[PDB]
Design a protein around this ligand. Structure first.
Ligand code: GTP
Ligand code: MG
Lengths: 51, 169
């Protein structure tokens, strides 16, 4: 993934998280947080920190 | 938790076919002729009662624009179902759909529920993909098949009801 596009989607999911936290949907905060974790793992992989 | 079944579903397909419009029709019961191309991937949910059980659809709406193709695995991986959308008026989008099937088959279990949505079915006078042929292809890959219209609210509910029926979780 083009690195800047990956960083932008991380920011997008963070925006979904900010909104799901401001509301009451706890189960969706977790779903979105899991996706955030996965995007961050992919970013760390693209930087060579893990395989 | 015990009563509510979470269902992760991912929308895939070429830019312009109507993935986001399908999602907005299902979730918000609306249509926008001027909806913009998706950036990255979007997310919506809907809680329903189908087959006398409660389900929450967790819907990931991927960007079909070319630069985002490499982002899609972040959304289709771990999905219970993939909805691959084409435009019945553009045969090239059905060829693209077959590429998406290959991508899924390379990276996901053969058991994943696949649904094929031939969207923009309201545009009957300019059809390029024959329904008979699309249905036959869907059968050949054991996929759900519907022709849909997000604009005219045709077969959108049917699509999700059948996905729910097929997911064995
Ligand atoms: N006539 C008709 N137009 C539709 C239908 N569904 C979507 N459109 C229109 O087709 C265009 C593209 O729809 P989108 O929902 O943005 O398509 P998409 O697949 O999400 O595209 P990307 O986000 O770029 O991948 C928009 O102008 C919609 O208004 C439909 O069922 N019938
Ligand atoms: Mg879209």
């Amino acid at each position: 993934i083009e690195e800047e596009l990956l960083l932008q989607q991380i920011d997008n999911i963070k925006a979904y998280i900010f909104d799901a936290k401001q509301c009451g949907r706890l189960d969706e905060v977790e779903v979105l947080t899991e996706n955030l974790r996965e995007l961050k793992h992919t970013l760390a992989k693209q930087k060579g920190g893990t395989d | 938790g015990s009563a509510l079944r979470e269902l992760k579903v991912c929308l895939l397909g070429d830019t312009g076919v109507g993935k986001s419009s399908i999602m907005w029709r299902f979730v918000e019961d609306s249509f926008d002729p001027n909806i913009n191309p998706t950036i990255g991937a979007s997310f919506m949910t809907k809680t329903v009662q189908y087959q006398n059980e409660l389900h929450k659809f967790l819907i990931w709406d991927t960007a079909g624009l070319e630069r985002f193709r490499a982002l899609a695995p972040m959304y289709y991986r771990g999905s219970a179902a993939a909805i691959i959308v084409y435009d019945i008026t553009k045969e090239e989008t059905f060829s693209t759909l077959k590429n998406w099937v290959r991508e899924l088959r390379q990276h996901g279990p053969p058991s994943i529920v696949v649904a094929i949505a031939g969207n923009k079915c309201d545009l009957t006078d300019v059809r390029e993909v024959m329904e008979r042929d699309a249905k036959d292809y869907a059968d050949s890959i054991h996929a759900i098949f519907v022709e849909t219209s997000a604009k005219n609210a045709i077969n959108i509910n049917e699509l999700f009801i059948e996905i729910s029926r097929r997911i064995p979780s």
